[PDB]
Design a protein around this ligand. Sequence first.
Ligand SMILES: Nc1ncnc2c1ncn2[C@@H]1O[C@H](COP(=O)(O)OP(=O)(O)O)[C@@H](O)[C@H]1O
Length: 535
Amino acid sequence: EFTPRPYQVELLERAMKKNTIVCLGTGSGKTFIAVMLIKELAHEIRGPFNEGGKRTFFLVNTVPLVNQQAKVIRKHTSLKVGEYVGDMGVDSWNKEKWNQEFEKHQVLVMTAQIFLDILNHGFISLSQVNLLIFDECHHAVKNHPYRQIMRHYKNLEQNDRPRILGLTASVINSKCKPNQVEKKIKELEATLNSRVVTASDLEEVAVQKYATKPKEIIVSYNSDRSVEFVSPKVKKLLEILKQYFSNNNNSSKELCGIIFVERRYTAYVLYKLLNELSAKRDDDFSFIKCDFVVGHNSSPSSKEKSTEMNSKKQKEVLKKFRKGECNLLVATSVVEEGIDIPKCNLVVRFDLPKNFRSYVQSKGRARAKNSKYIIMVEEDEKNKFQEDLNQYQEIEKILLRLCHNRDAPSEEDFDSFEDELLPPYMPYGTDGPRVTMSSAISLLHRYCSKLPSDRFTTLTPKFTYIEQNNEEENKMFRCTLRLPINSPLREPITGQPMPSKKLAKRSAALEACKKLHEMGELDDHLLPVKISRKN
RNA sequence: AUACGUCCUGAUAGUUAGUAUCCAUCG
RNA sequence: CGAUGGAUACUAACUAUCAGGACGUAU
Ligand SMILES: Nc1ncnc2c1ncn2[C@@H]1O[C@H](COP(=O)(O)OP(=O)(O)O)[C@@H](O)[C@H]1O
């Protein structure tokens, strides 16, 4: 029942020296050793939470992946595991419930932002956290919540060891030139205080996992000039699916084809058209079934129509695909990574990739033999797309060339973090509710929304911007806060002048937390009057 | 005829700010 | 409603270089 991997046991013993990051292609099995390293330190986690024990947290950005990884860890381990997501509405939960939750479970898999929230209000500090692994660590750039969490390491002492981990295949998240990749990798390895390694030998990975991705049958059309009325791209899909049927006459019923899109409306219309064609019972199209996977809760009541509700729908649709009930798939932005099917040999790239990372991630989804990669390109843009593809190939070649070990001898880069020009409130020191400079906006989201209050758009009570000349004539901004009649007086009516508008708002709104803490609205854990709504 | 210097539309490559549009993820 | 990331476009400044337009110096 247990399925090992030869290179990964070597990877584990190499990584169990210091902080180490593994970078490999899709299908490598890098995620699998997460459970092995979790069980390697299971003894520490056994500590009771009477005075604060050791617990392991697994951060996953996407909501459909938390249950999948929870089932994966449950399959090989007997430890109690729960699932956490803001869909349940945990915004109105007091300290005692959280203490009960921590004492009950053993591993709490949860998205990043909820971890931001819990660390923001001091329900528990970074102390006594046994281990912590990111998801898609290549997102840790600029003001990503990953970096916001990592910033809390600066406030605490270095002697503490809340080990951090994060796994990614592509180390970029935007378009770039082959002369800035070294700068990007150096910056990323400096930010998270960890080295990056990659398997030197890629035997099986090149056999069927990564280096033998589906062959790119670049097919063009004339779309730049219901199937026959909309752009002929749908006709190209029909022709390529007829080619698929001609290839797989033996499997004339169905296969595991997956369609990637970038706009939800396109996916919805595409699924509707193919379901209509299949239900018609015509000779050309009679055995096609597709279902939704993407869209997410979006918003409870604010200008949306998808209404994907709870994760139960995603769980059941993925189960019905795994059992073969669902065989065609359309989605936009949740099945790029973390979706695994043991037998898949066809991926249709209906919409073009936008950067390097998307192209690498959405290409290795197929894992079976003779897999098919299909790209929709136009004739006029064919030259530009060909040169862009050559650039991507060169980027991959140089990236695998620089796969040599890169250490971090200069720890000064970690100290070189661009600290904000103003300090935030912190009434109880480093051991108390350390308010972050980036959580002032979260606090101001819901002015007096707690307790009986209007349901109108009180979130944005409007602010006045004032500009004046200065010594360098770059101008300074006077952000002013004028809240309506809903609460007692406020100290930060206007903030300190700032070079930028955003920093002006931050300086004019951060002192609200400091003022409100003294007057008694908040508490020891900065939870306002322990009631629903508001952070 | 060459070289150098001041300002600028054009070009090569990077940074910063504002603005406008679009997309995705999540609370 | 909000925090974000990405993409394009405009203005605008600095940064290392090329060219041309307005002027000056050495040969
Ligand atoms: N030995 C194995 N046992 C079970 N599943 C596997 C194995 N090897 C690969 N897989 C499947 O293939 C996928 C590859 O996962 P892994 O190599 O851990 O990282 P990634 O998912 O990033 O490629 C997994 O989602 C898993 O379901």
